[PDB]
Ligand binder design. Structure first.
Ligand SMILES: [Zn+2]
Ligand SMILES: [Zn+2]
Lengths: 100, 100
């Protein structure tokens, strides 16, 4: 459930949805930039502010680890990103977003 | 340490190195194919048997989560793959290998 909500929050640029699956100790690396806790919710506000369109293309899963391939669109420009998450107790604990 | 050994085992096609950082409950998904425990060591034997050349290009990290971008070469053919790992207690617990 948490994993689906994570994707929907990005795809819809919905910070309040992302708040539901984040914890204060959620750790995220966005291409080397570190964000913790509510900073992850702010990351999503920035998606919405910019008008970024995220689309899930495909994913795999092993236990509590998920790996997503997504495209991000911004100003007629489409690019591929890999997004890795660890889920525990209905919360996203760690997140990595990396440019391909 | 475990994370570096994981990469070196792939890059060098060394099953015995991979044995050092795997546990019996290590779970791996290789593009939807599930491997557990010693099956991960056998995955590396298959790399070496085939003559596959893996090269780490870049990586990021958030807590115990690592995400690697690697190229794999095989028969004059080079392709990009994303490799996500979770490390705990010096062991790889979960692994995902996904084609880009
Ligand atoms: Zn979608
Ligand atoms: Zn290397």
């Amino acid at each position: 459930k948490a994993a689906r909500l994570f994707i929907e929050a990005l795809e819809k640029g919905d910070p309040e949805l992302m708040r539901k699956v984040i914890s204060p100790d959620t750790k995220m690396s966005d291409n080397g930039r570190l964000f913790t806790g509510d900073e992850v919710v702010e990351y999503v506000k920035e998606i919405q502010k910019r008008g970024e369109v995220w689309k899930l293309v495909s994913y795999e899963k092993a236990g509590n680890l998920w790996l997503f391939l997504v495209t991000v669109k911004n100003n007629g420009q489409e690019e591929k990103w890999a997004v890795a998450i660890v889920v525990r107790n209905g919360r996203i604990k760690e997140v990595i977003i990396m440019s391909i």
